[model samples]
Target: STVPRLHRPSLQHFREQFLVPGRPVILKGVADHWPCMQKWSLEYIQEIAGCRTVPVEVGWSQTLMTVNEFISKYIVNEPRDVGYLAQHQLFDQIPELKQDISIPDYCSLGDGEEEEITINAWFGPQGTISPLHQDPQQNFLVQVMGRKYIRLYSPQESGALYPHDTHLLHNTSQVDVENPDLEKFPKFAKAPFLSCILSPGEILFIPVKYWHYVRALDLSFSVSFWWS
Candidate 1:
C-alpha cells in the first residue's frame, strides 16, 4: 500500500492530519525549500568535509574512515562491499553543511520542543541497503539528493518481521526484506506493507516504532530528524 501524503503541509495541518495520530505519511516537496538541494552533492561534501573521519556501517559492524577515502573508494567506484554512511550525526561532525538545511517546524509537535531532536545525515551509493528496522522515536527522513526505495510495515506486524533474537539487534528484522528467507521466516510473506520510491525533495514521516527498510536507487544523500 502507498503511505498517505500531504503536499507542503502547514505545521498545524501536519500535526492534525498525521503527527498527532502517529501515522506514516509522505510530505512531497516539503523539503524542496532547503538550500541543501542546491549544494549537497557528492563532490561538494567530499570537498568540504573530506579530511574528517566518519564511521561507515558495514556487515553489522562499523569502520571509521576519512570522508575523502570513503568517497574515493566506495562512492566514486563500484565496490565488493557495501559501505553506508548511515545514521551518523554528521551535522555535529561537520557543522558547515548544517547551514544548508533546517529542521521542519512540524517537529514542534509531541513535546519535541521540550526534548532534543537528533539530526543525522545519510550519504551512500546505489544499492546501499538498511535492512528492516525500527526506531523508538518519531522520524522525518528528508531526501536531499538522489532516490531511495523504502518499504514500511506497521508495528503491529512485528510478529511477522522476525526480529533478531539478540538484545542488541532486537529492533532489527532477521529476514532479508528484499529476499525473505521464508523457510525460516515464512510469516514474513503474510505481512502487509507500504512502500514508495522516495525521490529528492520529499520527506517521509516515519512514526515511532514503524518498521522500515531502505535501499538507495542511486547515489543518495538524506538527512533525518528524530525527536521524542
Candidate 2:
C-alpha cells in the first residue's frame, strides 16, 4: 500500500530541482509502494498469469509484430513471462488497487469508468532495447523486478534525435546499444544525455516529449504507466 502512496516532495524540492527543468526523477520510495512490487517476482507472475496466454516479440527487426505479439514470440527474452492488462480493466481483476497512481492526483482523469489503460511488463534480454524516441505522454516507469539502464535526451536535443521525414516524431536510430550508425546520425555521438539505472523498487518519472532509450541489464521486468 505504501508503494502506491503519492510522494510528497517539498515545494522547494520540486521548484528547485525536478519541476523547473523537466528533468527525470528516480524516486526511490515508490518502488516498494506499487502493487507490482508484490506481484512481479518470477514465481509470483507465473502463478497468477501463467494460465493466461499473452503475445510477445523480440528484436527491432520484427517491426511488423504488434507490441504484444512480439512479446509473445520472445517469451524466453522475458524469463519472467509478461502480463498485459488494460489499466481500468485491472481494477475489475484486482479490486484492492484503489489508488490512482497518477501525478497530482491518484485518479486524475475521466470519471472512473472503465477507461482503458495499457499495462504491460517489458522484459528485456541483455542486448534488447527500445530505440530513442519521445514518449507522447507523461510516463511513470516502475522497475518492479529488475535492473534497467536508461539514457535520456532532453526535448531540447530534438535536432540530435534525427527524426525521420516519413514519421514526424520517429527517430532514425536503430535500437543499437553497441555500434550506433554514426555516418547517417553523426550528431548523436555528441548528444548530451542523462543516464540512470533503475533497480527493483525504483521509480523514474519521465516527462512528456523527452527522448529516451532503455536496456535491461539482465532479463528484467518493468511496468510503465502512460497517460495523456
Candidate 3:
C-alpha cells in the first residue's frame, strides 16, 4: 500500500523510477507552478464556462447541459442523480483555460511518434464515483481543486478484480470497489491495492493498463492528461 511519493521530481527521475517500472507514484507540488492553481475557482469557472454546453454523466447516461446549470443543480445543491462532467475535452473546447496548465516533460518518454496528447477535465461534487476501470494510455491525473480518494490495483490483480466479460465493459471490473459483494466476488477480498487521498496541486502518475477506482471526497475538479 506504500506508493512512492516524490517532491517535484525531475523528468529523468520520473521516467527511470516510476514510468519504466510501471509503478504508480504521487508527485507533490508537481503543478504548483500551474496558473490554474491560483486562477481556477467556482466563480472563475462559472464566469468563463457558464454558457458552454458540456457532457454531464448521471449514472450510466450522459447528457449535455450548460456549465451554469450543472453547477446549480449538482454542485450547489444535492440532486437525485450523481452528476459528473467526466472525460470531456474542456481544454480543447475552451482554449483559454488550456493555457493555465502545462504537460509534464516526462510524457515525452511514451513510445511511438508523439501523438496529440488527450486532456480531459473531471468536475463533480462530493460522492461522485468513477467505477473501477483501466485506461489504455499512461495517465497523469492532476488534482486541481479539492480532494479524491483513489485506489489502484496492478494489472496482475485482474483475476481478483473480476473484470467484466463483455467487450464494451472489458476494461472495467464488476466488483464494487467501495463495498464489495463478497458472495459474488469472493476473490476480490484478496486483491492487494494501493490507496491515496489526492489533494490539490498533486499529480498521480498511473501507468498504462493499471486498474484505478476514484471517488471525490469533496467538490472536486481534476485534469487528466493521457498519452501513448
Candidate 4:
C-alpha cells in the first residue's frame, strides 16, 4: 500500500527548508493518516499474520527468530511468535499505521546491490536502543507507533565513529552515548550532533554513511526498510 496523502503545502515547505538543505525534520500532523489507530488491539493483528515468522534480529553470527516455535531456543525473554503479541494486541494495530509509507527510489534493489529489501521491526521499551552505527543504504525510518530519540552525526565525523580495525565501513561506533570511553575514543567528545524525537506517524530520513543511535522514549514500534 502507498503512504497516505500528505498536505501539499506543508510538504512543499518541508522540501524547501529541510530536505533541500539535507537536514532532518520532525514532521507533525502526518499521524492524521492513521485514523484506525485507536482501534488496534492484539486480536486485530492475529487475524492477519500472527502465525507467520520473520527474521527478528542478528548479533555477531547468530540469527534470532520472533515466532512462537523459537521462543524456547533463546536464553532471554524474547518472544518467538507474534501470537504473544496478539495476546497483548500490538502488531495488528501497527501495520495499519504504515499503509501510506513512501519508499525512496534510491533504496531500490538492482544490479550489484549488496542487500535486498531488508526490513526490521523493533518493539522497544524506554531503554532499548541500537548501538551507534551507520547504515550503508539510504534509510527512511517512519515511526508507526510510540516514541524514540535519535542522535545523528555527519559523515565527516568518521574519525569520531571509532570503526573497527577489521572493517572500515562498519555501521556501529565504539563510543557509547550514555557513557563514552574517553581515554580510548576521546575524539567523540567533541563531535556535533543533530538530535530529534520521532513520534508516531513521523518520518526520519537518515542518509547513508551518517552515524545514528536510536533510543525508545516509551514502548515503541518502528519499521526500517533498507536496500543497497
Candidate 5:
C-alpha cells in the first residue's frame, strides 16, 4: 500500500500523528497555496539565477554547474549525462528566490526552529533517480513542479536494507530498491515499503532515518525543509 495520505493536516495533528510516531505520510493541498507553485517556472529560474554556480550531482560524484548551463544542457534541451541539482541550501544563496515559499509551519514543531531550519532544493529532468537513502533530519519535501515517484522504508528495517559499509555512505542502501539483485541482497526481498507518485502542490513528511527512493516522472523541482 502507499503511505497514508492526509489533506492539510494541522500542526498539532501533523506533529502527533506523523512526527512523534515518525511515520511517513503524503500531505496533499498543504503546499498548493505557495507562490512558488505559480511563480517559479524553469524560465523564471534561468532568468534569476542562471549565472550562479550550483552543485550538480551525477552518479555518486558532484561538479559545479552554472544554473544556466545545467538547465539548458541537462533539462531543457541536450542529451548529456543526467544531472540533479540536489541537496544544496539554494535559498541561502539566492535569497530573492526564498520569498516565493515560506518555511513550512510544521518546521517549528521540530527543534523549536530558532534559526536551525535548513532549506534545500532538488531540481532535475525526468528519469533522475535517487537511490534508497535516509536523511539525518526530519524533512518536509514540497513538490513545486512536475511529478516524482517516491518509495519509503522504515528505519526498523535497516538490517534488510544492507546499508553501505563506509561511514560516508552508510545512510545509503546498497540494494537498488526498484531492481534488486536478490542474489547479493536477499534480505531486501522481505523489506516492506510504501510509495507514491508525488504531484505538484503536495508535501511528503519524511521522518529522520526513514529510507526513501525518488525517481522523476517529469522534470521536477522540490524544496525540502529540514529540522531537528
Candidate 6:
C-alpha cells in the first residue's frame, strides 16, 4: 500500500505523529529550498569531482573509480554489470557540495545532537538495486534528482522478511523484494509493506531498524541523513 504524505509539517507534528509511532511518511516540498534541487546534474557533478575517485559497486563487488569515468562508462552507457555509488560520505569527500543541503530541524528532536548526524550519498543509473536491508538509525532519505522506487516493511515484520543469518548480511533480508522467489522465501509474500516512488525535492522518513528496498527508476541522486 502507499505511504502517507505530508506537506511542510512542523517538527513537533512530525516527531509526535510519525517518529514516535515508528511510521514511514513521504515529505513533499521538503527539499525545495535546497540548492542541489536545481544545481545537481550529471554534468555539474562531473565537472566538480570528475577526477575524484570514490568507491563504486559493480554487482556484488566493490571498486574505486573516478566520478567522470563512472558517469561515462556506467551511467551513460550501460554495461553488463550495474555500477552504484552507494553509501559514500559525499559531504565529507566534497565539502562544497554539503553547503547545498541542510539537516531538517526535526532531526534535532532525536536523542543525538546535530553533530552526531551521519550523512551518506547514493548515486547510480537506472536499475541499480540496494537490496532489502535495515539500518540501526532513523533515516531521512532525500531525493535530490531523478526518482526511485522504495518499498518499506515495518520492523515488526522482520520474521516474514527473512533477515540473513550471516554477520555481514545480518541486517539484510534474503528475499528479492521486486521479484520474490516464493518457493524459497514463501514468508516474504506475507510481509506487509508500503511502497512509493520518491521523486525530486521529496524526502522519506524511515524508522530505525525498518526493512527497506530501493531501486533507481532513473539516473538518481539521493542523500540520506541517519540519526539516533
Q: Which candidate gets the maximum TM-score versus the true structure?
A: 6
lDDT by residue for model 4 (52-155), tens: 66444333333434433333333224533221111122233445534544443434322325345555556433445677888776566767667888888888
Q: Pick by lDDT: which candidate is best?
A: 3
Task: Tell me the tens digit of each residue's lDDT in model 3 across 46-87.
Answer: 998999999999977989999999999999976878999999
The root-mean-square deviation over C-alpha atoms between each candidate and the true structure, in angstroms, is 1.4, 6.5, 1.1, 7.5, 1.2, 0.9
Which regions of candidate 1 are displaced past 4 Å?
A: none
- Model 5 agreement with the true structure over 16-114: per-residue lDDT tens digits: 989999999888877899899999888899999999999999866899979999998889887568889998999999999988998777787877564
TM-scores for every candidate against the unseen true structure: 0.95, 0.69, 0.97, 0.67, 0.96, 0.97
In candidate 3, where is summed lDDT lowest over 10 consecutive residues?
107-116
- What's the C-alpha lDDT at position 54 in model 4? 43
Return the lDDT, model 4, position 44: 38
- Candidate 4 matches the true fold with a TM-score of 0.67
Local distance difference test values of all predictions, in order: 0.89, 0.57, 0.92, 0.56, 0.90, 0.91
Better of 3 and 4 by TM-score: 3
**How displaced is residue 133 in candidate 6, in Å?**
0.8
> How does candidate 5 fare on TM-score?
0.96
Candidate 1 lDDT, 178-213, residue by residue in tens: 998899999999999999989889999999999999
Backbone steric clashes in candidate 1, count:
0
User: How many steric overlaps are in each model, in order?
Assistant: 0, 15, 0, 13, 0, 0
Candidate 3 similarity to native, TM-score: 0.97
- Model 6: runs farther than 4 Å from truth? none
Error of 6 at 90 (Å): 0.9
User: Which residue segments of model 5 deviate by more than 4 Å?
Assistant: none
